[PDB]
Amino acid sequence: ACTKNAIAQTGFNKDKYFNGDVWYVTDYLDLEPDDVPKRYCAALAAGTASGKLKEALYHYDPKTQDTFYDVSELQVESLGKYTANFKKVDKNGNVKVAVTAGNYYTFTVMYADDSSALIHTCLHKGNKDLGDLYAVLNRNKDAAAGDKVKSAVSAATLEFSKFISTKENNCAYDNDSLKSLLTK
Ligand code: FDE
Numbered sequence: 001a002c003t004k005n006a007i008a009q010t011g012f013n014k015d016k017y018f019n020g021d022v023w024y025v026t027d028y029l030d031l032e033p034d035d036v037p038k039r040y041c042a043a044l045a046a047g048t049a050s051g052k053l054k055e056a057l058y059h060y061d062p063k064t065q066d067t068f069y070d071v072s073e074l075q076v077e078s079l080g081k082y083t084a085n086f087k088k089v090d091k092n093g094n095v096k097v098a099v100t101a102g103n104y105y106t107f108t109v110m111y112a113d114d115s116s117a118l119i120h121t122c123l124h125k126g127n128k129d130l131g132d133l134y135a136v137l138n139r140n141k142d143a144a145a146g147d148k149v150k151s152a153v154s155a156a157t158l159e160f161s162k163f164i165s166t167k168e169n170n171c172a173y174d175n176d177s178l179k180s181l182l183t184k
Pocket residue numbers: 025028035036037040041042044057059068069070086087088097104105119121123125130133135
């Protein structure tokens with residue numbers, strides 16, 4: 001179940017966030033913690049491709065090796081808050097599972113600057129969801145969370161100390177496939 005109406009950053013700069021580059025998840029918190037493994041790797045590219053707002057996603061479970069990519073088309077609900085379809089694709093953009101009405105996530109950018117961000121998502125796959133999931137992002141896959149984003153976690157009435165880090169999982173990312181997937 002999702003329970004939070006996440007508030008988007010005041011004065012969110014959409015063109016900077018959606019610049020075509022990659023964001024790495026460095027830390028995450030699910031309010032239903034059993035919905036996601038204790039060890040995980042994830043990243044995303046976000047950009048406009050031929051006028052369309054897009055996100056490409058990568059998930060990797062470093063223990064099981066479960067791997068998947070997704071291409072997402074975002075619709076705007078308000079500045080910094082989106083609803084996103086998703087099609088599961090291979091790294092080259094070939095469709096494995098097509099878009100369908102029932103498969104979507106909400107996505108809210110709660111804080112962003114040029115190098116870090118805090119987002120919330122609520123994933124739906126039919127009648128199931130993956131709970132409220134918060135993620136701290138960085139442009140540098142190895143960056144420890146700095147004061148701006150940690151303060152934003154506190155401003156959302158969360159505690160950064162409770163977030164689970166991805167840094168000890170030997171995560172390795174295909175940045176090229178995330179960037180190319182934006183077009184697919
Ligand atoms: C730790 C983590 C982190 C993250 C992040 C993220 C972001 C930022 C966004 C997202 C989204 C998503 N996811 Fe996410 N994520 C996670 C997790 C996860 C998991 C475990 C999964 C699976 C579920 C199932 O159902 O199986 C996912 C999942 C997911 C999805 C689905 C895909 C397919 O195709 O199926 C999506 C769309 N994710 N995501």
